[PDB]
Design goal:
Bound molecules: MYO-inositol-(1,3,4,5,6)-pentakisphosphate, adenosine-5'-diphosphate, magnesium ion, zinc ion
Largest sheet: 6 strands, antiparallel
Helix content: 40-55%
GO biological process, one term: myo-inositol hexakisphosphate biosynthetic process
InterPro entries: Ins_P5_2-kin (IPR009286), IP5_2-K_N_lobe (IPR043001)
Keywords: Acetylation, ATP-binding, Kinase, Metal-binding, Nucleotide-binding, Transferase, Zinc
Order of helices and strands: EEEHHHEHHEEEHHHEEHHHHHEEEH
Family: Belongs to the IPK1 type 2 family.
Oligomer: monomer
Strand content: 15-25%
Number of domains: 2
Binding site for ATP: 15-18, 36, 130-132, 141-143, 216, 357
């Protein structure tokens, strides 16, 4: 892949860690593909090698692309089944390709995403996945987050709100406080993962209203609702109307029909149940896991029973924490086009559900995970009153 192929890629979005471009070309090699490119903010550490030592191919990975590839394949797939997970094929890229591509997209990237990161033009590799906004095609991206309450004996007396109130809902307050969002989200993950149909519908309405970085809709691969590479403001009446109009033809009628159809899809695919069992791989909560983290790296625990545990035990706990970290921050894409089908307008739609962004979380991140958790609850406690 060379500098001149850069033209054949168009901006599609990004998260904290990767840039994503869809193919606008004619090449059979790349039709229906997106290209996923790692960013450098501004291979495995010794402790990681040991943590994930159970998979040897995984920890001998030469670069980060093959790393995520094997992670998903060897650690995640066995857990979520391969029907909705794609580990993505690896492709070679040149420096001038990434540089040029990076030059190209800056214009459509959000400002604070540009301040924080660019493309890591030092990588000689990049991941090619299937464009899930392509089966007319209406795809929907959901970022569910953690859909459960912690229950740990390791959550302090001073933190009696963490077993009652979702981490999402507490985080909304902090986000708002640092001018990262404009108004509190109506979305509640507990509704989405509730495994009740009525309550999934509730969550999907809630997502439509205040989408933030949790909800997005694409027509033939182009954003029609939701922020581009970022969070977006509440859906205003102008937004409502233009999204409504973007629907014509697809929903024979429209917005409420669409949300019902999304709700029925999610629910009847039970794709969120399996995801939830993985998230729940966080059996102790950070307030528990962090102690094990300090044993692992053989550092005296600054935070101070959990320490009386065998290394292998401590290791599996921090391992599964990170694995749940991954499930807690992945996303789901559901493709729609007129056993996996959905049905007033009398239409029946086919649909496909995929997992995206199953990224391996850096072990070092256990420290800032604890720092942030600490910050979330102490800000939520203060507020009540
Ligand atoms: O810590 P969280 O729960 O806020 O999750 C982060 C997400 O924030 P969110 O609350 O969804 O707005 C966050 O999303 P944004 O960057 O805020 O769009 C990232 O996806 C981040 O992962 P990473 O930086 O790409 O490795 C996420 O970090 P991890 O928890 O996966 O390490
Ligand atoms: N296979 C795919 N099909 C369609 N869109 C995708 C695909 N992979 C990524 N994207 C788009 O690009 C965005 C960034 O993807 P993601 O893998 O979440 O990046 P990050 O690792 O930075 O969080 C996603 O939110 C999604 O809309
Ligand atoms: Mg993601
Ligand atoms: Zn400790």
């Amino acid at each position: 892949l060379e500098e001149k192929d850069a033209s054949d890629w168009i901006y599609r979005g990004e998260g904290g860690a990767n840039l994503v471009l869809a193919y606008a070309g004619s090449s059979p090699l790349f039709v229906g593909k997106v290209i996923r490119i790692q960013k450098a903010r501004r291979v495995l550490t010794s402790d990681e090698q040991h943590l994930w030592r159970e998979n040897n191919e995984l920890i001998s990975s030469p670069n980060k692309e093959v790393l995520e590839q094997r992670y998903v394949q060897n650690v995640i797939i066995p857990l979520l089944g391969p029907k909705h997970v794609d580990a993505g094929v690896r492709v070679s890229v040149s420096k001038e390709f990434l540089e040029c591509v990076d030059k190209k997209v800056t214009k459509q990237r959000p400002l604070w995403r540009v301040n924080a990161a660019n493309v890591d033009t030092s990588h000689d590799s990049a991941l090619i996945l299937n464009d899930h906004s392509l089966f007319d095609c209406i795809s929907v991206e959901i970022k569910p987050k953690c859909g459960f309450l912690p229950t740990s004996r390791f959550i302090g007396k001073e933190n009696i709100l963490k077993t009652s109130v979702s981490r999402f809902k507490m985080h909304q307050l902090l986000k708002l406080e640092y001018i990262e969002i404009s108004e509190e989200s109506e979305y509640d993950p507990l509704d989405l993962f509730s495994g009740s149909k009525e309550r999934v519908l509730e969550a999907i309405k809630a997502l439509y209203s205040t989408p933030q970085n949790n909800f997005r809709v694409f027509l033939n691969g182009s954003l029609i609702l939701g922020g581009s590479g970022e969070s977006t403001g509440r859906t205003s009446p102008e937004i409502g109307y233009a999204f409504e109009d973007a629907l014509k033809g697809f929903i024979q009628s429209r917005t409420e029909c669409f949300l019902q159809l999304v709700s029925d899809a999610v629910y009847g695919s039970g794709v969120l149940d399996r995801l939830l069992e993985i998230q729940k791989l966080d059996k102790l909560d950070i307030e528990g896991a962090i102690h094990c983290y300090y044993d692992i790296i053989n550092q005296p625990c600054p935070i101070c029973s959990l320490h009386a545990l065998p290394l292998d035990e401590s290791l599996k706990i921090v391992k599964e924490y990170l694995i749940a970290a991954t499930a807690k921050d992945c996303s789901i894409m559901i493709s729609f086009q007129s056993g996996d089908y959905v049905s007033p307008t009398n239409q029946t739609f086919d649909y496909k559900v995929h997992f995206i962004d199953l990224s391996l979380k850096p072990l070092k991140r256990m420290e800032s995970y604890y720092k942030l958790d600490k910050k979330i609850i102490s800000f939520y406690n203060r507020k009540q009153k």
